[PDB]
Design a protein around this motif. Structure first.
Motif, PDB file in Angstrom:
ATOM      1  N   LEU A 188       0.826  -1.143  -0.087  1.00  0.00           N
ATOM      2  CA  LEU A 188      -0.047   0.020   0.018  1.00  0.00           C
ATOM      3  C   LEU A 188       0.754   1.223   0.035  1.00  0.00           C
ATOM      4  CD1 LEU A 188      -3.012  -0.591   2.568  1.00  0.00           C
ATOM      5  CD2 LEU A 188      -2.943  -0.363  -0.045  1.00  0.00           C
ATOM      6  N   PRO A 189       0.525   2.280  -0.325  1.00  0.00           N
ATOM      7  CA  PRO A 189       1.256   3.762  -0.559  1.00  0.00           C
ATOM      8  C   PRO A 189       1.498   3.934   1.052  1.00  0.00           C
ATOM      9  CG  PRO A 189      -0.586   3.814  -1.981  1.00  0.00           C
ATOM     10  CD  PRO A 189      -0.724   2.563  -1.387  1.00  0.00           C
ATOM     11  N   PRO A 190       2.714   4.456   1.399  1.00  0.00           N
ATOM     12  CA  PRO A 190       2.796   4.735   2.746  1.00  0.00           C
ATOM     13  C   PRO A 190       2.057   5.755   3.604  1.00  0.00           C
ATOM     14  CG  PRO A 190       4.950   4.773   1.433  1.00  0.00           C
ATOM     15  CD  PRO A 190       3.818   4.436   0.364  1.00  0.00           C
ATOM     16  N   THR A 191       1.227   6.351   2.808  1.00  0.00           N
ATOM     17  CA  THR A 191       0.476   7.498   3.240  1.00  0.00           C
ATOM     18  C   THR A 191      -0.946   7.187   2.869  1.00  0.00           C
ATOM     19  OG1 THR A 191       0.327   8.912   1.419  1.00  0.00           O
ATOM     20  CG2 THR A 191       2.033   9.270   2.937  1.00  0.00           C
ATOM     21  N   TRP A 192      -1.256   5.805   2.549  1.00  0.00           N
ATOM     22  CA  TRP A 192      -2.721   5.485   2.325  1.00  0.00           C
ATOM     23  C   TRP A 192      -3.638   5.601   3.492  1.00  0.00           C
ATOM     24  CZ3 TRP A 192      -5.948   2.055   4.215  1.00  0.00           C
ATOM     25  CH2 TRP A 192      -7.065   1.445   3.570  1.00  0.00           C
ATOM     26  N   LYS A 193      -4.696   6.001   3.222  1.00  0.00           N
ATOM     27  CA  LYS A 193      -5.513   6.273   4.314  1.00  0.00           C
ATOM     28  C   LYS A 193      -7.040   5.847   4.339  1.00  0.00           C
ATOM     29  CE  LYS A 193      -7.391   9.773   3.490  1.00  0.00           C
ATOM     30  NZ  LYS A 193      -8.873   9.769   3.348  1.00  0.00           N
ATOM     31  N   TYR A 194      -7.663   5.231   5.123  1.00  0.00           N
ATOM     32  CA  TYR A 194      -9.185   5.013   4.940  1.00  0.00           C
ATOM     33  C   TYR A 194      -9.953   5.883   5.771  1.00  0.00           C
ATOM     34  CZ  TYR A 194     -13.353   2.478   6.551  1.00  0.00           C
ATOM     35  OH  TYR A 194     -14.595   2.302   6.813  1.00  0.00           O
ATOM     36  N   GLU A 195     -10.869   6.431   5.266  1.00  0.00           N
ATOM     37  CA  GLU A 195     -11.929   7.267   5.736  1.00  0.00           C
ATOM     38  C   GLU A 195     -13.322   7.035   5.139  1.00  0.00           C
ATOM     39  OE1 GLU A 195     -10.734  11.382   5.448  1.00  0.00           O
ATOM     40  OE2 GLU A 195      -9.099  11.152   6.893  1.00  0.00           O
TER      41      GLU A 195
END
Ligand SMILES: [K+]
Ligand SMILES: [K+]
Ligand SMILES: [K+]
Ligand SMILES: [K+]
Ligand SMILES: [K+]
Ligand SMILES: [K+]
Ligand SMILES: [K+]
Ligand SMILES: [Mg+2]
Ligand SMILES: [Mg+2]
Ligand SMILES: [Mg+2]
Ligand SMILES: [Mg+2]
Ligand SMILES: [Mg+2]
Ligand SMILES: [Mg+2]
Ligand SMILES: [Mg+2]
Ligand SMILES: [Mg+2]
Ligand SMILES: [Mg+2]
Ligand SMILES: [Mg+2]
Ligand SMILES: [Mg+2]
Ligand SMILES: [Mg+2]
Ligand SMILES: [Mg+2]
Ligand SMILES: [Mg+2]
Ligand SMILES: [Mg+2]
Ligand SMILES: [Mg+2]
Ligand SMILES: [Mg+2]
Ligand SMILES: [Mg+2]
Ligand SMILES: [Mg+2]
Ligand SMILES: [Mg+2]
Ligand SMILES: [Mg+2]
Ligand SMILES: [Mg+2]
Ligand SMILES: [Mg+2]
Ligand SMILES: [Mg+2]
Ligand SMILES: [Zn+2]
Lengths: 98, 140, 141, 83, 129
Positions: free
Chosen positions: C134-141
């Motif tokens: 995953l991208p190092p800054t991948w974020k779930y919202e």
RNA sequence: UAGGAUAGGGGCCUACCAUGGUGGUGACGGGUGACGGAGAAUUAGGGUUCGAUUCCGGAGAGGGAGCCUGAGAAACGGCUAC
RNA sequence: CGCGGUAAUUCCAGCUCCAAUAGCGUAAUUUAAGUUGUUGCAGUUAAAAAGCUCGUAGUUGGACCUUGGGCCGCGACCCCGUUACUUUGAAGAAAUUAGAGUGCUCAAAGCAAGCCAUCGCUCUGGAUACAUUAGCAUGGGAUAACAUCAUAGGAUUCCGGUCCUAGGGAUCGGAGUAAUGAUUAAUAGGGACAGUCGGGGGCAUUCGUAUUUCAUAGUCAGAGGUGAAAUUCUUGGAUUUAUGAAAGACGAACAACUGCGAAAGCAUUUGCCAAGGAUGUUUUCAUUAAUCAAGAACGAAAGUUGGGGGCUCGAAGACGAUCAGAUACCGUCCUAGUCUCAACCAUAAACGAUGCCGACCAGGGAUCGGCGGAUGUUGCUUAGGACUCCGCCGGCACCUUAUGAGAAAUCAAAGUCUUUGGGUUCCGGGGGGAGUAUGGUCGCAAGGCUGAAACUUAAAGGAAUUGACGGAAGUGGUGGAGCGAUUUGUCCUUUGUACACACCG
């Protein structure tokens, strides 16, 4: 001291059990704990049976019965002798009356 | 169970530190309340006899224990000190120097005497044992 | 044990001891590989690709025949999904529950299950960030 | 029975078939692939025994198997042989 | 979860020996369990054991000869120098005449007497007697 | 960063600049009838408690502060002041 | 602990005896204390598992990778990632400690001394060990931690370019090379798919009798309630009967040693919405996991604020009884409440008084869910359903038994414990004071969470036995059982007990 393994009720794998109301005193007793009897009687006492069977217009008429499932708390069941205090060994016997 | 990990030294040490306060002896030692006691951590204390009193024993026993009311000199604290050795109350007079000691149970009351954890040991510089055994005399 | 329940089921598949293809398998390796490529081309995920290759083709297990796993083969030919499939499905479940709760506010049970689903999402996303899938800054919202 | 009456290394093969798939000496699947022979058309079309997909004859004919909880149900009037 | 496969192996063997069983199956298998079993076999406390390859974590079927009183692990695997072997044997062994403490050392997995013979310390795996 | 100061490094101090630094791996604060250690008592092992005192290190000379002399003191059986 | 009320083995004395002895008595700390527990304690009922779940840090984490073999000969031979850990070495003052030598007369000591006697000698001796942790160095790499771990895009020859420098070096490319480079898929876990299953949840919808009220109609002296009454209703029709409508609750029987849910909890129909376990799987990822301070979500009933509703029941209140009294139990009418919406509250004997994950270890028959196999009968629509039988997995449980454990009760886990160590969280340390004071924090409040001390006390408490009591029901022996008191034998008994001076407790 724990008197019974089941704690005086019938409740495994569940939480709350709805209560019933005692037929005698209207006490709130859990349905699984209350003493339950299915009484199948006749609307006519064994004595009046003949007199009634006689005063019948229809010759073929089976006298209707009464079916009732009676709920009792522990105190009323013991007072009414529906259940009686038993010895330690005999309490583990769950068999219905022989 | 209890923690067993090789890396759980801090957990074990902190848990023991927190649980040692449940022990009565540990907490008595490390609370600092023994400095508020009449003796303030000393084995013995001197005091002035304020008045000679007799306090009744517990319920099973029937006796008048005949203790003494002593005002300590180091802090001015008033205590009740038992006088052993039958007849030794007559060696005790008001405004007389007495050396008090503990009643042997570390501030706990002893025997049938309620509320007394201190005994008179020396009066006017003379031991009560010497006066009982007539080995010495009380100075005038 | 189930991660988020007391269920203790042990139902699962049991791969055969023989790691080589059965003699009745005759499909050439390139054949199964390009079949996988088409399967991913419509949009199937590797689990569905394996299911279809198992029940609609004479391919019991891809690894036995080709020697590689489906996701590895897809990565080789540049058709692997951006979000890993399990995380994709967990996020789909989470958004479905979120829509249901946007319609149903009193559903406290569904709120509890959503909390569990998002906990699973955070676990799997942490693992994928640590493994750099995953991208190092991948974020779930 | 009593394990002192058996050898754990050479278990009786009769009672190994009835063990759970994972509780055997070496775990093996109890599923299989089959050469399903339809009514009249050749269409061997190998099927997984526990198929989760509705297998359809190549000539877009009627369905051949039906997914179930366990083994797939072959459609009426079809034979099969293990592979 | 399974934290120590050696603990499960040794505890299953201990329970089987107490039960009077002549065979015990060990799952999972591991190199440390086969190395512990070799020490056990060398000192005569077990008989034949068989590694069963299942293309996974293996299985071990061990013959039991009734000579085991107890086998167990020490968790954690405390660091044991050569000089602390005496204290450990006093702690864990029935007598100074019998019993073995199993150590993992950079020279290999071995009993405490063999560790003394090469003057090599390490970590304690367990014990058997 | 540049100086000043010091026997000499150093925010030790000054000017300018930046916004840093420590913290549940407990910072900061509070308590200690707390000088630290070598050690002491008791100890199957593990441990518990003590360690003002003759050896080593530190600190003080009623409480603060400031100095002169001198290689060496912020000295007190030296000085100056409160 | 107890002694002393006229016979004091216990006080005051005499005699005698006992212990230690030039000493012994009395008034913080160690041991005793496995009563702080790392070794090594507990938490069903004695004190103690958070109501339940998620979750960060912390703690703990499946298996897998150079092995064999022989030879010489216990060493060796052959076929520019760290760290913990361990080994060895150097240090770690002296004194103290351990310990070598040595007849201070012994000894505690001391570091002296000894030698046929010596114008001197024994070079006289004045050792050695220990010394955590951290630091330095040596060997080892099993175990373990961290970091990587298919653009390896790996490397090596040949052919080049550029720069620097007496051919050499540095830098950037082209072309050639090799087994081109990926552990397996955990009776770990997540995800997918399939047919199911469920009184799991939300929304809407349907139904049911009962009950209250109202309307109509019949009837006429009681109805109601209790042990008995009374309060109360009633000729202005009470109660009862029939019909119909409205309202609000409530979902009987079926209904279980049954199901579902994290717990609380969940039982009328149908439909929709999302979710879930188990089973099946030759589907997929590949360690992603376990438990958790911080931090969150839910959390019976009662309670609070406001709106709606308000049948029934019903704290408080009023009244009627009973009563010696009766602020109760019994009866009547009832307020808040009970129902619902919004917002709070976060507590229960929230219990299995038993935290969760994992392994092993008895037998048996039921039951629920799924799957597989074998069946021969179906008011059945070949399959399939319904029964029957045999298995496998999972679940609520039950029965027997000890080879176990336990203080026992009892528990198949509460077992695998002085033969003591799988992982992890919380939590107890005699009884009270006390869940009190105070501080803090949350809450509108009620209160919740956190949480003492002074002081007081020798027991409190648990399990079991015998007896006695109940305004509960109907004497040895030997052998056997029990740790034991006891028990069996002896078939008033059973039962409860907080009594044992034994209920006149
Ligand atoms: K009952
Ligand atoms: K499954
Ligand atoms: K300087
Ligand atoms: K500077
Ligand atoms: K000078
Ligand atoms: K079952
Ligand atoms: K007898
Ligand atoms: Mg409940
Ligand atoms: Mg400077
Ligand atoms: Mg001081
Ligand atoms: Mg000192
Ligand atoms: Mg001082
Ligand atoms: Mg002095
Ligand atoms: Mg000094
Ligand atoms: Mg000075
Ligand atoms: Mg002075
Ligand atoms: Mg000065
Ligand atoms: Mg002076
Ligand atoms: Mg001086
Ligand atoms: Mg006498
Ligand atoms: Mg205890
Ligand atoms: Mg209790
Ligand atoms: Mg308790
Ligand atoms: Mg491992
Ligand atoms: Mg509570
Ligand atoms: Mg509780
Ligand atoms: Mg609980
Ligand atoms: Mg233990
Ligand atoms: Mg207490
Ligand atoms: Mg006997
Ligand atoms: Mg009772
Ligand atoms: Zn009743």
């Amino acid at each position: 001291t724990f008197k019974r393994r089941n704690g005086g009720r019938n409740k495994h794998g569940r939480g709350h059990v709805k209560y019933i109301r005692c037929s005698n005193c209207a006490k709130c007793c859990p349905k699984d704990k209350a003493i339950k009897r299915f009484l199948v009687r006749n609307i006519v006492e064994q004595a009046a049976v003949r007199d009634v069977q006689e005063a019948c217009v229809h010759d073929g008429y089976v006298l209707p019965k009464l079916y009732a499932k009676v709920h009792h708390c522990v105190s009323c069941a013991i007072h009414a002798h529906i259940v009686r205090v038993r010895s330690r060994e005999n309490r583990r016997n769950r068999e219905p009356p022989q | 169970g209890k923690t067993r990990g090789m890396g759980a030294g801090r957990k074990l040490k902190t848990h023991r530190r927190n649980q040692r306060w449940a022990d009565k002896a540990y907490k008595k030692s490390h609370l600092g309340n023994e400095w508020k006691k009449p003796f303030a951590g000393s084995s013995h204390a001197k005091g002035i006899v304020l008045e000679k009193i007799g306090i009744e024993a517990k319920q099973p026993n029937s006796a008048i224990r005949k203790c003494a009311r002593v005002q300590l000199v180091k802090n001015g604290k008033k205590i009740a000190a038992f006088v052993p050795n039958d007849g030794c109350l007559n060696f005790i007079e008001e405004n007389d120097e007495v050396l008090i000691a503990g009643f042997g149970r570390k501030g706990h009351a002893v025997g049938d005497i309620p509320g007394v954890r201190f005994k008179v040991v020396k009066v006017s510089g003379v031991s009560l044992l010497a006066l009982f055994k007539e080995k010495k005399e009380k100075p005038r | 044990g189930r991660m988020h329940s007391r269920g203790k089921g042990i139902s699962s598949s049991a791969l055969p001891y023989k790691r080589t293809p059965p003699s009745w398998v005759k499909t050439a390796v390139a054949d199964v590989d390009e079949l996988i490529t088409k399967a991913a081309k419509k949009g199937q995920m590797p689990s569905q690709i394996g299911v279809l290759l198992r029940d609609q083709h004479g391919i019991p297990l891809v690894k036995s025949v080709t020697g590689s796993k489906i996701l590895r083969i897809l990565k080789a030919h540049g058709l692997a999904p951006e979000i890993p499939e399990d995380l994709y499905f967990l996020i789909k479940k989470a958004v479905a529950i979120r829509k249901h709760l946007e319609r149903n506010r009193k559903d406290k049970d569904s709120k509890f299950r959503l909390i569990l689903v998002e906990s699973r999402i955070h676990r799997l996303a942490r693992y994928y960030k640590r493994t750099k899938k995953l991208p190092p800054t991948w974020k779930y919202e | 029975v009593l394990q002192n009456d058996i050898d754990l290394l050479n278990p009786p093969a009769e009672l190994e078939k009835l063990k759970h798939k994972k509780k055997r000496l070496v775990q093996s699947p109890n599923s299989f692939f089959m050469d399903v022979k339809c009514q009249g058309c050749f269409n061997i079309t190998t099927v997984f025994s526990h198929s989760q997909t509705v297998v359809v004859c190549p000539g877009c004919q009627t369905v051949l198997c039906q997914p179930t909880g366990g083994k797939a149900r072959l459609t009426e009037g079809c034979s099969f042989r293990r592979k | 979860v399974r934290v120590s496969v050696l603990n499960d192996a040794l505890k299953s063997m201990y329970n089987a020996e107490k039960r009077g069983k002549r065979q015990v199956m060990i799952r999972p298998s591991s190199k440390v369990i086969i190395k512990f079993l070799i020490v056990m076999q060398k000192h005569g406390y077990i008989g034949e054991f068989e590694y069963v390859d299942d293309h996974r974590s293996g299985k071990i079927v061990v013959e039991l000869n009734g000579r085991l009183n107890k086998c167990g692990v020490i968790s954690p695997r405390f660091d044991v120098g050569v000089k602390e072997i005496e204290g450990w044997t006093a702690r864990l062994l029935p007598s100074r005449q019998f019993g073995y403490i199993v150590l993992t050392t950079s020279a290999g997995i071995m009993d405490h007497e063999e560790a003394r013979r090469k003057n090599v310390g390490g970590k304690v795996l367990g014990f058997f007697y």
